[PDB]
JSON list of C-alpha atoms and ligand atoms in Angstrom, two decimals:
[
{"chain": "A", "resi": 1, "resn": "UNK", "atom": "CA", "xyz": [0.00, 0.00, 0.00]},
{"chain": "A", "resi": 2, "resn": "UNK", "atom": "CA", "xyz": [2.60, 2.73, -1.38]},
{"chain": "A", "resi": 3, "resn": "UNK", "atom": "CA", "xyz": [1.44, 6.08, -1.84]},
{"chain": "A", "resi": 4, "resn": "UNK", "atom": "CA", "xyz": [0.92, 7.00, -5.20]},
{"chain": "A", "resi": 5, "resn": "UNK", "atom": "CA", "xyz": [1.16, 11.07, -5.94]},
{"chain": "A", "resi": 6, "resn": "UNK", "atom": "CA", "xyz": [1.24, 12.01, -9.65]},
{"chain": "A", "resi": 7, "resn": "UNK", "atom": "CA", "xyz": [2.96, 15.41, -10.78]},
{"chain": "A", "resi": 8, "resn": "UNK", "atom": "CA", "xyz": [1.75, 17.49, -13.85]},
{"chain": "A", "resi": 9, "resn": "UNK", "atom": "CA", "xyz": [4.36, 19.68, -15.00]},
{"chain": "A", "resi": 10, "resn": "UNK", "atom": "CA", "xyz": [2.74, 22.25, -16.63]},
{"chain": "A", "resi": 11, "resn": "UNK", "atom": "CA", "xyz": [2.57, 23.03, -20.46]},
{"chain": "A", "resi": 12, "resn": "UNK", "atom": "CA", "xyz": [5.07, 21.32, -22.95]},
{"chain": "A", "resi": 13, "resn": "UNK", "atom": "CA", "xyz": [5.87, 21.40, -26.42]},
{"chain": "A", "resi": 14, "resn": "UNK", "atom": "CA", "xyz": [4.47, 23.87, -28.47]},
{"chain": "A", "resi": 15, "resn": "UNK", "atom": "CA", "xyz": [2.62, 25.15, -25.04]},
{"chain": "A", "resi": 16, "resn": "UNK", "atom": "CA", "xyz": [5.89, 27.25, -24.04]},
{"chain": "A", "resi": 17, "resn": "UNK", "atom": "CA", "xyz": [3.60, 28.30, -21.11]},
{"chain": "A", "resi": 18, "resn": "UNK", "atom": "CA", "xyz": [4.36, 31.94, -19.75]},
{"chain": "A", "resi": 19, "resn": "UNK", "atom": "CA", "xyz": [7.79, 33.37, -20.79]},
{"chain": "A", "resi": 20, "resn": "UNK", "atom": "CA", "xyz": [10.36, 35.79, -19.05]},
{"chain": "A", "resi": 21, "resn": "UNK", "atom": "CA", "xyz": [11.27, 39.43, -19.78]},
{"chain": "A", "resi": 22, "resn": "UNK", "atom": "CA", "xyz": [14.29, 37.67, -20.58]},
{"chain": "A", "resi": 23, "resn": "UNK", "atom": "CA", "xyz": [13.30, 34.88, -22.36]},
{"chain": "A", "resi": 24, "resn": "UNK", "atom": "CA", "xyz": [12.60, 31.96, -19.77]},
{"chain": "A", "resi": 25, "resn": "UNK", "atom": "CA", "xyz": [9.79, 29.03, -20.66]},
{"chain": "A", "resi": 26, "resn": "UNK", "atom": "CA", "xyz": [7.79, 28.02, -18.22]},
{"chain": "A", "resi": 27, "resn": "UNK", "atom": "CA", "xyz": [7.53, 24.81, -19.41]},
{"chain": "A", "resi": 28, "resn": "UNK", "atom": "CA", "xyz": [10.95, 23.88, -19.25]},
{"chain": "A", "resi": 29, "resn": "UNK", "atom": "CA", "xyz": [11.61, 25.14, -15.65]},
{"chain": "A", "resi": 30, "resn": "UNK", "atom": "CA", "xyz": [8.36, 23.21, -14.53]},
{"chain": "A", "resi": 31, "resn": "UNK", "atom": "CA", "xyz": [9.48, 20.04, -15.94]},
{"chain": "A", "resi": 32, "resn": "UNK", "atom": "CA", "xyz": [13.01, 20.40, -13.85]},
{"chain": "A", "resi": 33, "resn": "UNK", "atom": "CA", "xyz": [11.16, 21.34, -9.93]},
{"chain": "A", "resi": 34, "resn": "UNK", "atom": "CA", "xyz": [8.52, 18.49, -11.33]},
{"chain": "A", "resi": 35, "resn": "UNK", "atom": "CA", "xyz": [11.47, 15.99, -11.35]},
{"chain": "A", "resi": 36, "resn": "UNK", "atom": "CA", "xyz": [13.03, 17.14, -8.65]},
{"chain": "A", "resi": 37, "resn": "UNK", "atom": "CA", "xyz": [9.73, 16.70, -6.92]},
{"chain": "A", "resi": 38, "resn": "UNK", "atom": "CA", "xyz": [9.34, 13.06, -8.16]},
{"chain": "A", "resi": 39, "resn": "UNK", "atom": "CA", "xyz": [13.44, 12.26, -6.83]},
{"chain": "A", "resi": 40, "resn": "UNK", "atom": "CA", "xyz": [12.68, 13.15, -3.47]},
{"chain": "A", "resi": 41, "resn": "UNK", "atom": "CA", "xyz": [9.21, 12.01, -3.22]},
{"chain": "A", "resi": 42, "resn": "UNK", "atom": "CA", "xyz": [10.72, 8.42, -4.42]},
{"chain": "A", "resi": 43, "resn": "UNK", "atom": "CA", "xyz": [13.48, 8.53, -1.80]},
{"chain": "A", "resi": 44, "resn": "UNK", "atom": "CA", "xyz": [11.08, 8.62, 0.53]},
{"chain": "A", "resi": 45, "resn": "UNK", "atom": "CA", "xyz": [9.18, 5.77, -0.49]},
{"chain": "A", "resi": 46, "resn": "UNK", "atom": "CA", "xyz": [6.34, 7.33, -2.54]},
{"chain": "A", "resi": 47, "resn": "UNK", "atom": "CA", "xyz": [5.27, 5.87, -5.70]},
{"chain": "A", "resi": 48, "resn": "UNK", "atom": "CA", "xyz": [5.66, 9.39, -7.40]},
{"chain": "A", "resi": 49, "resn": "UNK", "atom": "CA", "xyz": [4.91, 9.99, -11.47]},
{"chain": "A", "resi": 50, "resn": "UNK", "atom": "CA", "xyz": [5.04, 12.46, -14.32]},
{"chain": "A", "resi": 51, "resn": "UNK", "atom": "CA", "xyz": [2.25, 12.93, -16.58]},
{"chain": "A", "resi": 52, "resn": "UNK", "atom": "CA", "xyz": [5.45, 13.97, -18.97]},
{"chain": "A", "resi": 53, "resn": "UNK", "atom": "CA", "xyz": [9.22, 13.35, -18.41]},
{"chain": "A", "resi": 54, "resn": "UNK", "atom": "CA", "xyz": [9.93, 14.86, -21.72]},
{"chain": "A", "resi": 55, "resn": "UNK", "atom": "CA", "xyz": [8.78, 18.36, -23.49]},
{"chain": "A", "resi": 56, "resn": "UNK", "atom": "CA", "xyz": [5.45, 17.07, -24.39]},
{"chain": "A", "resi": 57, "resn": "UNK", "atom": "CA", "xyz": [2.04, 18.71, -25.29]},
{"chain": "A", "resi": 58, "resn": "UNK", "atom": "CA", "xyz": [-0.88, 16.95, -23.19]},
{"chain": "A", "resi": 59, "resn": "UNK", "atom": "CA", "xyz": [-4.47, 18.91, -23.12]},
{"chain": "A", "resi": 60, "resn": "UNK", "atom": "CA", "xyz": [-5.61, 19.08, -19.91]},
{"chain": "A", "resi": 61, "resn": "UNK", "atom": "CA", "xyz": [-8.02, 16.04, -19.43]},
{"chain": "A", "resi": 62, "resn": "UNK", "atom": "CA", "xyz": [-5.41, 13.82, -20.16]},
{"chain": "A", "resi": 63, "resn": "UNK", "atom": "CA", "xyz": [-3.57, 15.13, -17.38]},
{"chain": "A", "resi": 64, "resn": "UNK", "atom": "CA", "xyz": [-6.30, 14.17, -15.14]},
{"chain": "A", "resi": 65, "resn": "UNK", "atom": "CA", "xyz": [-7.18, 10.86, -16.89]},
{"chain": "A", "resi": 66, "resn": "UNK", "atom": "CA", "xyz": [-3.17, 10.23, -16.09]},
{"chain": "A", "resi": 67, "resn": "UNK", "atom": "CA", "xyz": [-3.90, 10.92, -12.60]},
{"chain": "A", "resi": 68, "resn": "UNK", "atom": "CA", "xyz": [-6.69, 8.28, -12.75]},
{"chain": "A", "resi": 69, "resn": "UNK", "atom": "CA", "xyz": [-5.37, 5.56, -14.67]},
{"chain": "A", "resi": 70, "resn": "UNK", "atom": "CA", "xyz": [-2.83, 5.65, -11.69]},
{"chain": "A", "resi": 71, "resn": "UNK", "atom": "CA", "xyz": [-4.69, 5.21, -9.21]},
{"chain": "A", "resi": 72, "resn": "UNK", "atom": "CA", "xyz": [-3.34, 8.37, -7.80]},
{"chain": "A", "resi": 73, "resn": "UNK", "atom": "CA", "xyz": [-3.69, 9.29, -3.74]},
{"chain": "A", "resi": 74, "resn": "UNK", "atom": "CA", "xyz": [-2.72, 13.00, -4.78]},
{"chain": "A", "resi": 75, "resn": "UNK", "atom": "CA", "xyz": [-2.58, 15.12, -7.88]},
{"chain": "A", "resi": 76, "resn": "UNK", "atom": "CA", "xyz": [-0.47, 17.99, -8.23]},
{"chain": "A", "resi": 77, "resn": "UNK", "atom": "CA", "xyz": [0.36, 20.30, -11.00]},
{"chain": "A", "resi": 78, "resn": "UNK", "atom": "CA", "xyz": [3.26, 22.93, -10.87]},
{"chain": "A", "resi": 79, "resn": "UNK", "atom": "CA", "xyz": [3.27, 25.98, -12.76]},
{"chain": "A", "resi": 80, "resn": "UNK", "atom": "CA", "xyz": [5.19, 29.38, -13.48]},
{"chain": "A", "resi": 81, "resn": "UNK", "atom": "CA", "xyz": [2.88, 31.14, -14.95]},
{"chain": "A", "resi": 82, "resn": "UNK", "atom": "CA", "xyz": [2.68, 34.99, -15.77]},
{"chain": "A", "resi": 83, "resn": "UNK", "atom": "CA", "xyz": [0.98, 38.43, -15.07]},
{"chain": "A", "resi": 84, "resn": "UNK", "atom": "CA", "xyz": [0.64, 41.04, -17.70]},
{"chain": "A", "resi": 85, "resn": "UNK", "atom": "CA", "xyz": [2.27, 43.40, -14.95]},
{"chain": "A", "resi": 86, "resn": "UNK", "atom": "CA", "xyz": [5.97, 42.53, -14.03]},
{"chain": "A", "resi": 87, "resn": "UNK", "atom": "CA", "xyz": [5.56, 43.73, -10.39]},
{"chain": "A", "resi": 88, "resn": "UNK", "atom": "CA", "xyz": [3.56, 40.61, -10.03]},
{"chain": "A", "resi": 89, "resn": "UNK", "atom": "CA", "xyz": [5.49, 37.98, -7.62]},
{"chain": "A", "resi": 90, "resn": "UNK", "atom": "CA", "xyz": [5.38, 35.15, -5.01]},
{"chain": "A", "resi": 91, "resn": "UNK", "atom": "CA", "xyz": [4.20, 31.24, -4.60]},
{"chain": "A", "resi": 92, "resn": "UNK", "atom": "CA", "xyz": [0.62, 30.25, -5.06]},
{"chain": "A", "resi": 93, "resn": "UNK", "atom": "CA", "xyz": [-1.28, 27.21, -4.38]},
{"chain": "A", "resi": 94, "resn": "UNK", "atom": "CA", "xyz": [-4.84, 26.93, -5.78]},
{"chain": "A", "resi": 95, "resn": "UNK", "atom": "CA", "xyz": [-7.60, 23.96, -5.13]},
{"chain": "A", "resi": 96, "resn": "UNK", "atom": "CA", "xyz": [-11.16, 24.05, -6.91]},
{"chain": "A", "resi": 97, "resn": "UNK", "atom": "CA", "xyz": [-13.94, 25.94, -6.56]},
{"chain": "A", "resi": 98, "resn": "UNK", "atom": "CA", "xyz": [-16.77, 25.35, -8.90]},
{"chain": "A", "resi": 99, "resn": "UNK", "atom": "CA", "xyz": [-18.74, 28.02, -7.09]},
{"chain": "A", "resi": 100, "resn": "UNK", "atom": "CA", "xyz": [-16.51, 31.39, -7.99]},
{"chain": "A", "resi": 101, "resn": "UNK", "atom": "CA", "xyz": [-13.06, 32.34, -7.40]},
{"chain": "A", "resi": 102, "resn": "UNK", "atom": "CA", "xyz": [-11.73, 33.01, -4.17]},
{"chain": "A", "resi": 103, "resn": "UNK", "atom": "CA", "xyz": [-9.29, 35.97, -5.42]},
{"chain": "A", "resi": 104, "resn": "UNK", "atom": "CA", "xyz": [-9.09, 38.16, -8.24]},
{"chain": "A", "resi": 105, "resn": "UNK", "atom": "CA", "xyz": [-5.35, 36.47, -9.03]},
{"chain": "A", "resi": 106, "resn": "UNK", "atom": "CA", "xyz": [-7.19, 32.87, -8.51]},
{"chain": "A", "resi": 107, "resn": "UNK", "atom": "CA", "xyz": [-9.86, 34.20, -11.08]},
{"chain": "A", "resi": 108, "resn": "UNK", "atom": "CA", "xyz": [-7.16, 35.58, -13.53]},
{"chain": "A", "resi": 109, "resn": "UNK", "atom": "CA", "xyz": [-4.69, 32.13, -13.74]},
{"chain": "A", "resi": 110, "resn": "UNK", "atom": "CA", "xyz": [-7.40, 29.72, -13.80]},
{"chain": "A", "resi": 111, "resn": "UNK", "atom": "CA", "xyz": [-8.31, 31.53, -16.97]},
{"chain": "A", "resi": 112, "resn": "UNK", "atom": "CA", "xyz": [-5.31, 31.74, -18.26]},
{"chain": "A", "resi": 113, "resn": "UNK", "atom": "CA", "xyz": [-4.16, 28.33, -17.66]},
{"chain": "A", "resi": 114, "resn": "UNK", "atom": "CA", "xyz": [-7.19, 26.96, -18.80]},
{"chain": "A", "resi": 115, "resn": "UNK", "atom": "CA", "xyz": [-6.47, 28.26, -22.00]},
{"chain": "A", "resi": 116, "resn": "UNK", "atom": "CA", "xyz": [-3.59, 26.05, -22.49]},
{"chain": "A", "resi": 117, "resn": "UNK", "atom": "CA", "xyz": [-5.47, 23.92, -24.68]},
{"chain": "A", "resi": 118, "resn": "UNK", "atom": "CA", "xyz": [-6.28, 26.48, -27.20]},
{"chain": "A", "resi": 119, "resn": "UNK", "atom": "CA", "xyz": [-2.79, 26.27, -28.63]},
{"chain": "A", "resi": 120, "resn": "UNK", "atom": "CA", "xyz": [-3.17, 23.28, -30.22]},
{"chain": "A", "resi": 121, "resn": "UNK", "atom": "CA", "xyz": [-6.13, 25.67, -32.36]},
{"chain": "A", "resi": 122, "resn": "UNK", "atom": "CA", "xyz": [-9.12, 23.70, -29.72]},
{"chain": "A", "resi": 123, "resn": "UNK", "atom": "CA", "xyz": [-10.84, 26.78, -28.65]},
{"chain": "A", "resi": 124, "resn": "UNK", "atom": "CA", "xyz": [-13.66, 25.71, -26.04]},
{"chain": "A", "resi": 125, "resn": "UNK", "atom": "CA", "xyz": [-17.64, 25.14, -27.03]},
{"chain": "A", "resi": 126, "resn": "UNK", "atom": "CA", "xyz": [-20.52, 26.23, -25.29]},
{"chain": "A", "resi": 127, "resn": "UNK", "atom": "CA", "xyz": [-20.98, 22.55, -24.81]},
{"chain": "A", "resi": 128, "resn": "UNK", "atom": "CA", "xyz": [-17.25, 22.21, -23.55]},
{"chain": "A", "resi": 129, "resn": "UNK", "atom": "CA", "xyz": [-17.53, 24.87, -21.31]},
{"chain": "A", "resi": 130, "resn": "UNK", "atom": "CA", "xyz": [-20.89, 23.61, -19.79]},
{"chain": "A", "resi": 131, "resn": "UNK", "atom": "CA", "xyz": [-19.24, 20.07, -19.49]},
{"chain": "A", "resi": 132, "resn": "UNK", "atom": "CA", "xyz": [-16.95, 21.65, -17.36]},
{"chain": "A", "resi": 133, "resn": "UNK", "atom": "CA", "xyz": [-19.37, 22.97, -14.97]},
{"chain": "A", "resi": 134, "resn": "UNK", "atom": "CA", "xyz": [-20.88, 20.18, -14.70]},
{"chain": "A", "resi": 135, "resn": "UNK", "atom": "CA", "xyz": [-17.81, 17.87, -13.99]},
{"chain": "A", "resi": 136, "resn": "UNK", "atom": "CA", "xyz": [-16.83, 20.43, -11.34]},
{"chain": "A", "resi": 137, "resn": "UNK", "atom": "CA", "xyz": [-19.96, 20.53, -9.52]},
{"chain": "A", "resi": 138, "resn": "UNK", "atom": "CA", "xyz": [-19.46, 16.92, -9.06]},
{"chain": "A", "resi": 139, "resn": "UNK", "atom": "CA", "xyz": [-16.12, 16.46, -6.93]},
{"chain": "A", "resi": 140, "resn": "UNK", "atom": "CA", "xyz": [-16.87, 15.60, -3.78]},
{"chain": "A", "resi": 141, "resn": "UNK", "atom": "CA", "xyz": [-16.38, 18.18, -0.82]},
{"chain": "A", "resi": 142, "resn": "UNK", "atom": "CA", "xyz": [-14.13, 16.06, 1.03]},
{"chain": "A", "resi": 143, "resn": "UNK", "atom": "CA", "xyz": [-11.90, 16.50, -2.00]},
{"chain": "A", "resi": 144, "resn": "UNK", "atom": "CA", "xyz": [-11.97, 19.73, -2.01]},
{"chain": "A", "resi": 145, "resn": "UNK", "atom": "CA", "xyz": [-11.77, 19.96, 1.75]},
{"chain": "A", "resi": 146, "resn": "UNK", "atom": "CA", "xyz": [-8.54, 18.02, 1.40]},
{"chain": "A", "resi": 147, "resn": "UNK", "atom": "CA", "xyz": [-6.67, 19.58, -1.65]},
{"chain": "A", "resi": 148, "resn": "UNK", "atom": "CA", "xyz": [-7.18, 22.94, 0.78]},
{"chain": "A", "resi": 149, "resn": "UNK", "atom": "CA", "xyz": [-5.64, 21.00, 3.57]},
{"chain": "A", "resi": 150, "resn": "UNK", "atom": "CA", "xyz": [-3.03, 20.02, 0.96]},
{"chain": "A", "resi": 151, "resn": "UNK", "atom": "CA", "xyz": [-2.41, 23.46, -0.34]},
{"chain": "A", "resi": 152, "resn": "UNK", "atom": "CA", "xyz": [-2.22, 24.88, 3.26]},
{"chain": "A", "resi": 153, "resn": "UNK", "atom": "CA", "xyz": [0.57, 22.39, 3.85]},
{"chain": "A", "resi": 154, "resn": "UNK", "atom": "CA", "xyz": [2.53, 23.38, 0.71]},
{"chain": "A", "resi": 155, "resn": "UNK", "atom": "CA", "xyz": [2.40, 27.07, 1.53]},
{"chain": "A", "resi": 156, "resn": "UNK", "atom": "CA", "xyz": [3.43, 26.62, 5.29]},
{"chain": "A", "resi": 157, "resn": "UNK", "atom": "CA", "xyz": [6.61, 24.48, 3.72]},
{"chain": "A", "resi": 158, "resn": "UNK", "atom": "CA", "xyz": [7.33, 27.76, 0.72]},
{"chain": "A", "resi": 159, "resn": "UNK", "atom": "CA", "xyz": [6.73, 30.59, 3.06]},
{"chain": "A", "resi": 160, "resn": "UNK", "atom": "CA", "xyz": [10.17, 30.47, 4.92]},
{"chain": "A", "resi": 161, "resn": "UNK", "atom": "CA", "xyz": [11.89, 30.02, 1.48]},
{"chain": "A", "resi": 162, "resn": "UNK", "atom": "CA", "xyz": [10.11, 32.16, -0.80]},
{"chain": "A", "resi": 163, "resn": "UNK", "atom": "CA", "xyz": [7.28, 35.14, -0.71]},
{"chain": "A", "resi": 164, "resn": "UNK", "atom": "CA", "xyz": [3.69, 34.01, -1.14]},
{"chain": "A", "resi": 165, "resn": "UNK", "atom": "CA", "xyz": [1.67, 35.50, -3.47]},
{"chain": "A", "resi": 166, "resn": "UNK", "atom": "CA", "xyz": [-1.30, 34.53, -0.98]},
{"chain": "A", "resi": 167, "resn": "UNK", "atom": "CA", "xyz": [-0.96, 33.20, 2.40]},
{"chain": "A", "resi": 168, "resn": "UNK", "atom": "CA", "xyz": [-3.98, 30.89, 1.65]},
{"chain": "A", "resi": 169, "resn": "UNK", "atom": "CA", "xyz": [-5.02, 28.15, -0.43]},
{"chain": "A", "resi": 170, "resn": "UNK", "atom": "CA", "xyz": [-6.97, 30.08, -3.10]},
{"chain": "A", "resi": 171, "resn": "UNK", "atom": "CA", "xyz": [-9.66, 28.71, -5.27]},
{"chain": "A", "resi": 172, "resn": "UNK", "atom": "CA", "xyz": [-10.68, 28.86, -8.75]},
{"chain": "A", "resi": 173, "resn": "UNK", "atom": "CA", "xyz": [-11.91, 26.70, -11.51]},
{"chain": "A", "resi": 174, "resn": "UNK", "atom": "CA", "xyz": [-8.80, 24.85, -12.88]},
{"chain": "A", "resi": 175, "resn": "UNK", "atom": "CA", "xyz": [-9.62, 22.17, -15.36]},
{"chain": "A", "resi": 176, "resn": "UNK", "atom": "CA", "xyz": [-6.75, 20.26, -14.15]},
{"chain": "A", "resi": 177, "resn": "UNK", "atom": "CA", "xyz": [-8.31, 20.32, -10.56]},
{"chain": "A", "resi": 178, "resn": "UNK", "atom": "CA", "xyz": [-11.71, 18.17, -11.97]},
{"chain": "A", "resi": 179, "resn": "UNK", "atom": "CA", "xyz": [-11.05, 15.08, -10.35]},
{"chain": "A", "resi": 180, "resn": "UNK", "atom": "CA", "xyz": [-13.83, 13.96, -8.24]},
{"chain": "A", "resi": 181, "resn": "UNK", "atom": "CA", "xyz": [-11.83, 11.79, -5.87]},
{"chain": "A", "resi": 182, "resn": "UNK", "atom": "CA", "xyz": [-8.63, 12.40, -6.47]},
{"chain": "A", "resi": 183, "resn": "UNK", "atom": "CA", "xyz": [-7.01, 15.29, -3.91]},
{"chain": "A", "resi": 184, "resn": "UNK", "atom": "CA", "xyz": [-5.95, 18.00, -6.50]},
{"chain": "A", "resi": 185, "resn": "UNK", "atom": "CA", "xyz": [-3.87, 20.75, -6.30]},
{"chain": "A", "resi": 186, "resn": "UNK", "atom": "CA", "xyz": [-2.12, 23.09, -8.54]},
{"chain": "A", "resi": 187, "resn": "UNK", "atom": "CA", "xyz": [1.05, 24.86, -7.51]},
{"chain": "A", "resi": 188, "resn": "UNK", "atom": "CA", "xyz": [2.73, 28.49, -8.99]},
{"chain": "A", "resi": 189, "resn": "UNK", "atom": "CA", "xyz": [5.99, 28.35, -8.08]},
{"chain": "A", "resi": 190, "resn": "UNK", "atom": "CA", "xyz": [6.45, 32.31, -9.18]},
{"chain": "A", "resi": 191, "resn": "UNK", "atom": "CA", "xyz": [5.67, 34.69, -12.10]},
{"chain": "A", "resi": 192, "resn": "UNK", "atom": "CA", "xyz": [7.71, 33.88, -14.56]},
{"chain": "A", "resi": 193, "resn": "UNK", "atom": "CA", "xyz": [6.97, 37.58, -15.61]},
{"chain": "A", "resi": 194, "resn": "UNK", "atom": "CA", "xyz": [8.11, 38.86, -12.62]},
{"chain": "A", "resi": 195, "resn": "UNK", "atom": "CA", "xyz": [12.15, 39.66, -13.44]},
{"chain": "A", "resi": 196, "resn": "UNK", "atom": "CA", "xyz": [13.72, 38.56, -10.62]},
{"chain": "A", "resi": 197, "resn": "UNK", "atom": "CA", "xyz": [11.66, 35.65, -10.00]},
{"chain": "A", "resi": 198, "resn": "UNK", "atom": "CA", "xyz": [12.31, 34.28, -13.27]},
{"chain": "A", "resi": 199, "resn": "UNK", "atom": "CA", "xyz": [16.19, 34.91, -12.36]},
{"chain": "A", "resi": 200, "resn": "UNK", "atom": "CA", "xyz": [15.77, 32.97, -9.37]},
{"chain": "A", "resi": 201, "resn": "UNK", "atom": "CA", "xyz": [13.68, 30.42, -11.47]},
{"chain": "A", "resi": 202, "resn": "UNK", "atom": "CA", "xyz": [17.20, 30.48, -13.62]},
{"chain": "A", "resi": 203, "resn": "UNK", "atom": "CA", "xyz": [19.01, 28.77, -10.51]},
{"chain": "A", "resi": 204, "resn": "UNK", "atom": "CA", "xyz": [19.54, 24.99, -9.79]},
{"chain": "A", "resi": 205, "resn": "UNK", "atom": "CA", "xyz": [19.60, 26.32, -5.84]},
{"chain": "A", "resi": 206, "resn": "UNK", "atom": "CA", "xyz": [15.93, 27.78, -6.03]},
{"chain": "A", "resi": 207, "resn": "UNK", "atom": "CA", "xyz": [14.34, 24.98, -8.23]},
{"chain": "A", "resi": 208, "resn": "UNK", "atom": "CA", "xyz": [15.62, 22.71, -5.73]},
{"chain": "A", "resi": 209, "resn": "UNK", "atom": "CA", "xyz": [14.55, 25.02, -2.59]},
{"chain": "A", "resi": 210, "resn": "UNK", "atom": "CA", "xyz": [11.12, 25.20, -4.28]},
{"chain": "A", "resi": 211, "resn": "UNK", "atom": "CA", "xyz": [11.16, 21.28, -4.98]},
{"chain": "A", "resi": 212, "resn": "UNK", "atom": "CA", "xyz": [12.12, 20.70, -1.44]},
{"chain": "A", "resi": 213, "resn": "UNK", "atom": "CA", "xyz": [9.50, 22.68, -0.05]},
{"chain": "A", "resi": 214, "resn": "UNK", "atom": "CA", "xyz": [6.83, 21.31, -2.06]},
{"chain": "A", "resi": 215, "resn": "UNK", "atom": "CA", "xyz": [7.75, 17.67, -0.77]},
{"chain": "A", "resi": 216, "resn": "UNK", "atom": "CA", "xyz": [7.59, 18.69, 2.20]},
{"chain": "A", "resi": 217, "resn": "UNK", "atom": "CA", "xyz": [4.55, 19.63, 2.06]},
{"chain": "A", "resi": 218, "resn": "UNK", "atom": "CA", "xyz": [3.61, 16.46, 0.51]},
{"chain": "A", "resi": 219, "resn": "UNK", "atom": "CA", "xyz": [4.97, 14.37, 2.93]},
{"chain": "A", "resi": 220, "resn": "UNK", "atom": "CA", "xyz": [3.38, 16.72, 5.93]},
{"chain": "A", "resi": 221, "resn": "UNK", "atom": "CA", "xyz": [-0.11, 16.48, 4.27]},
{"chain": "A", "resi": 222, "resn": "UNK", "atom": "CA", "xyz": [0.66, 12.36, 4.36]},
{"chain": "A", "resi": 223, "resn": "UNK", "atom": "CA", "xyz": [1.27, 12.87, 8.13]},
{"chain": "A", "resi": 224, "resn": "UNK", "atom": "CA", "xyz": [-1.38, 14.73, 9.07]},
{"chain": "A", "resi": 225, "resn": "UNK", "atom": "CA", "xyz": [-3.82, 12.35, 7.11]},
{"chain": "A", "resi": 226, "resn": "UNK", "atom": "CA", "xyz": [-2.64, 9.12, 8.40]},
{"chain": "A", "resi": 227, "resn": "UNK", "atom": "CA", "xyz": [-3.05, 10.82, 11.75]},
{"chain": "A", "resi": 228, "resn": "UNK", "atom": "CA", "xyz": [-6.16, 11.69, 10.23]},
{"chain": "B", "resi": 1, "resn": "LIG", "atom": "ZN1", "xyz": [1.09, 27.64, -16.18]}
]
């Protein structure tokens, strides 16, 4: 009875995700915390996967339908994503809400990141778009209640290490957060728009601070649950 967690590293392939001032993909610093995230997850004796090890394109179900076909315990995505205003900065952790967003910011990435899937030209139906609502209105609160409980342990772990964008779990509605069962959390690391984050996003030492905190976080949330 290992632990199973599965790690979605954001974007890939011709999704470049958010870039830099200066340049910097999000998807290619995502996929290096993401492993780092799986190492130390594994040395500690959890069953951890990528929905990608490689610069990959995946829409956004099949990131979810990953996290399923696993058998996942937890589901976590990590991001880098960007503000059209530089000043923009600090660590995020969002879990669902099919209700409304919790914060403007929430309100703003879930859009944005939801959008992913347009760059392979699918822009979203009516009939997509109500499919959605749908499919969130059905996770179970206990998932939700959870993924907070999550998120609240991830941010506790970044705070001492890096600024928080928020000092709460926000909520919004992520596609990637749809599972009904399935704990689900999605993690910005920074704003890649935000010059001196994406500087620090340019460092082996911060992408492994960040990776290290997040696992923490992890392995508190484990903790606390098996405490219950
Ligand atoms: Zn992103």
């Amino acid at each position: 009875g290992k632990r199973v967690v599965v790690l979605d590293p954001g974007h890939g392939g011709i999704d470049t995700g958010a870039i830099g001032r200066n340049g910097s993909k999000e998807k290619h610093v995502v996929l290096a915390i993401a492993k780092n995230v799986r190492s130390i997850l594994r040395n500690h004796g959890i069953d951890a996967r990528l929905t990608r090890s490689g610069d990959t394109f995946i829409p956004l179900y099949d990131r979810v339908e990953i996290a399923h076909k696993h058998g996942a315990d937890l589901f976590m995505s990590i991001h880098a994503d960007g503000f059209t205003n530089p000043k923009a900065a600090g660590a995020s952790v969002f879990a669902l809400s099919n209700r409304g967003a919790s914060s403007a910011m929430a309100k703003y990435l879930s859009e944005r990141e939801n959008r992913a899937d347009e760059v392979a030209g699918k822009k979203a139906t009516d009939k997509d778009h109500l499919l959605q609502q749908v499919l969130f209105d059905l996770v179970q609160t206990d998932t939700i209640k959870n993924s907070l409980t999550l998120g609240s342990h991830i941010l506790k772990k970044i705070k001492p290490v890096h600024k928080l964008h928020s000092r709460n779990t926000e909520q919004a509605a992520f596609v990637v957060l749809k599972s009904p069962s399935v704990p689900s959390v999605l993690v910005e690391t920074s704003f890649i728009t935000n010059p001196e984050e994406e500087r620090l996003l340019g460092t082996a030492a911060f992408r492994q601070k960040i990776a290290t905190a997040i696992a923490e976080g992890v392995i508190s949330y484990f903790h606390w649950f098996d405490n219950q």
